[PDB]
Amino acid sequence: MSKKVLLVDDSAVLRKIVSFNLKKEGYEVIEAENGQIALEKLSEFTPDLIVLDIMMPVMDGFTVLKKLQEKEEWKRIPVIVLTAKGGEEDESLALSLGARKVMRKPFSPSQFIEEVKHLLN
Amino acid sequence: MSKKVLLVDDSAVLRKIVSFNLKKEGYEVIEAENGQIALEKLSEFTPDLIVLDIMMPVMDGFTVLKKLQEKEEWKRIPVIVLTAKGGEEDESLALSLGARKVMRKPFSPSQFIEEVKHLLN
Amino acid sequence: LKRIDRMKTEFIANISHELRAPLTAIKAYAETIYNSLGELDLSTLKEFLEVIIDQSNHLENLLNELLDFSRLERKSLQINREKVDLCDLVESAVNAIKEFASSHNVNVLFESNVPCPVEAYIDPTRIRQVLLNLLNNGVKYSKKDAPDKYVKVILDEKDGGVLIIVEDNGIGIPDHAKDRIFEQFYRVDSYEVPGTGLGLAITKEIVELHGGRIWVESEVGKGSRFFVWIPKDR
Amino acid sequence: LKRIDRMKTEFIANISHELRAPLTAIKAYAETIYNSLGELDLSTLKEFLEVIIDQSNHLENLLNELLDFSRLERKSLQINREKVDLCDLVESAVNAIKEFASSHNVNVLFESNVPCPVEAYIDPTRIRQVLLNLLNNGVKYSKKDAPDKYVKVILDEKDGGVLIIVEDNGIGIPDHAKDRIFEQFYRVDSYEVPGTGLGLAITKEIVELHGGRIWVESEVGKGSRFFVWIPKDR
Ligand SMILES: Nc1ncnc2c1ncn2[C@@H]1O[C@H](COP(=O)(O)OP(=O)(O)NP(=O)(O)O)[C@@H](O)[C@H]1O
Ligand SMILES: Nc1ncnc2c1ncn2[C@@H]1O[C@H](COP(=O)(O)OP(=O)(O)NP(=O)(O)O)[C@@H](O)[C@H]1O
Ligand SMILES: [Mg+2]
Ligand SMILES: [Mg+2]
C-alpha cells in the first residue's frame, strides 16, 4: 500500500538523485523526461504526488500545471514544483496554476522529502 | 625512514586534503599557515619537498622562494607551487625564483601526487 | 561619464576569485573520497563529505548574490512583510553564524535593551539576510591577532522605529572609504580576501525598501558598528 | 553608443545560469551521500561521487572561461608554440569528448585527407581548447533527436597552411546570425540550454593569435561546418 510519485524533469542527473531519495522513504518512482511524456503517463494511472520541473523541452512545467487543474480527475493531485526559477513572478505564477509548493534549485534533499511527506499526509 | 614534506598554505581546508593524500603515500606532513612560519619550521629540519601557496598573509610565496634559493641548505630543496594565481607571468616568476613545478588550483589530487613522486627521485 | 562599465569587468574577476577556492575544495575532496575509499575511516569520510557540502553553500551564496544583483539592476527586488518577532529573528540569525565564527574564533553575543518580544511588520527572510550579511562581515574582517574577539548585536527602539546595531572589534573602516562601502562593487582594497562588493549594496537596498536607512560608525583599528533603523509600519 | 554595458549584464545572468545547475547537483549528491551512508551500496556511492566530480569539472570549465574572458579584455592572452604532430593532437581531443558525446548520443570522426604525421609550430594546449570547443558545440547544439548524429573533423592543408573543418548534424545557424556568433556574448536565443556566449570568442582569439583566421559555413537544418586555417611555421 505504498505511495507512488510522478517525477518530471529534463535532466537525468536530477531525476537520479530524486528517485533515490524518494525510494529511500518507500515510494514508487515514475519518471518523465518532459511535460508531454508526463501527461502520457498520467493517463495510465493517478499519482499521489507530482514533482514538476518548469524549464523543460517540448512541454514546460507551466502548461502541465494548467492541464492539471483542468481535467477534474487530476485537479486534486498535490503538485510540488522543483524549478531553478527564483523570481517572485515565477513562484506566484506556478502557485496560481494549482501547485501546492514551489522549491528553488539548488534544494536541500532533507527539506524536500519533509515537504513531500507533509503533502502526502 | 619515511619522507618528510613541508606544507605551506593559509587555507587550513587545503592543508588537510593535501596532508591526507601526502600521508596516503607514506610521507610525513609538517604544516605551516604562512610563509614566515614556514621559514621558522625550516630551521628545525630540512624537508625533501615543499608545497607552497603564493597568496598568503604576512609572507607571500614569492618571498619564500627568494629566501630559499639563496641559502645553500635550502637551494636544492625541490618546491612545488600550488597556487590559485594561474596568471601568465605568475608561473614564470615562481619558476625563475627556483620552483621546480607550479601547479594551479583547482588541481587533481592524483596529478599532484604523481608530480611529488617525480621530484622525490 | 560611464565608468560603471569599468567596474563591472572587475566584478567578473571577483566572481572567478569567489568561485576558484570552493571549486578547488569540491574537486579535491571529491576525487579524494573516490580514489581513497579504502583509506578512509567513517569519521574522515563524513568529514570530507561535510567539507564538500560546506563549499557548495559558499557557491550557493555566490549564486544568490548574482540573482539579487540581477534584482538590483531590474529594481524588481520586493519585500513580503510578515508579523515577526525581532529578538526571535535575530536569535535565529545569530545561532546560524555561530558555527562559522567558531572556525575563525569570534564570540557572537546578543543583547537587547528592550524586552523581548519586539514584534514588527517586516520581511523575515530579507532581514535575516541583512543580519547574516552584517554578521558575516563582522567576523571575516575581524582582526586576526587578538584575544577575546567578539561581534555583538543590540536590539533597540529609538525614534519610534527600531534601531539595530552590529558592533565588532574588527580592523575598522578608514575615514576615507566609509562613504563608498554601500555603493556597488566597492571594497576597501588592502590580500587574498574573496569578495564582490554587493553585500552592503543588497543590505542597503533591503533596509531602505523596508522604509528606513542604514549607516556606519567605525574607527581605524578599534572596531566597526553598523546601524539599521526600520519603522514598525503596523 | 555603449550597449557593451548592456550585453555585459546579460552575460552576468548567464554566469548564474551556468552556476545554478551543477551546484544543484553537487549539493544534492553530496548531501545524499552524507545522510544515506548506511543505505548507499558501493556502486551507487562511487556513482554519486562520480557525479560530484563531473559537475565540479563543469564548474571548472566555467571558472576557466571567466579567466580567459579576463584575458580578452586585457589583451594579455599569449600562445606558446612547439612543434606538435597535429594528428596526435586532434586524436587527443576527439577522445576527451567521446564520452561526453556518447552521453548525449553522438559519435566523433576523423577523416584526414593527408597522411600523418602533420607537424606544425603551434600551441597544442590552446589548439586542443579550439578543438574541444568546436566538438562540445558539435554535440551540445546538435540535432534535436534525429537518427545518426555525428561530428566530423577533416584535417587538410591548403593555401600554404593547415585547414581543419568541424562538421556536425547540428540544428544549423540561421543566415541572419552567422555573422555575429564570433562576437562576444552573442548566442542564437531560439530553452533549457546553458550558454555563456563567448565560447567562439575565445576560439577566434586563439586562431587569430596563431596567425590564421576562422569562419563558419552553415545551413538551417543541414548542419554546421566551422573552418579553421592556421599556417605551418618553422
Ligand atoms: N565589520 C567590518 N569591519 C571592518 N570593515 C568592514 C566591515 N564590514 C565591511 N567592511 C569593509 O567594507 C566593505 C564592504 O563591502 P561589501 O559590500 O560587504 O562587499 P563584500 O566584502 O564582498 N561582502 P560578501 O560578498 O558578503 O563577502 C569591505 O571592503 C570591507 O573592507
Ligand atoms: N556546432 C554548432 N552547431 C550549431 N550552432 C552552433 C555550433 N557551435 C556554435 N553554434 C552557435 O554559436 C552560438 C554561440 O556560440 P559560442 O560563442 O561558442 O557561445 P556558447 O557555445 O553558448 N558558450 P560555451 O558553450 O559555454 O562555450 C550559439 O547560439 C550556437 O547557436
Ligand atoms: Mg530543467
Ligand atoms: Mg592562499
Numbering used by the authors:
A (entry chain D), B (entry chain B): 1 to 121
C (entry chain A), D (entry chain C): 244 to 433, 437 to 480
From the primary publication:
Here we report a molecular mechanism that gates the phosphatase activity of the bifunctional histidine kinase HK853, a member of the HisKA family, from Thermotoga maritima. In summary, our combined solution NMR and crystallographic studies have revealed a pH-gated conformational switch that modulates the phosphatase activity of the largest family of bifunctional histidine kinases.
These observations suggest that the T264A HK853 mutant still formed a complex with the response regulator RR468, but the critical chemical entity participating in the RR468 K105-fluorine (F2) interaction was absent in the T264A mutant of the HK853-RR468 complex.
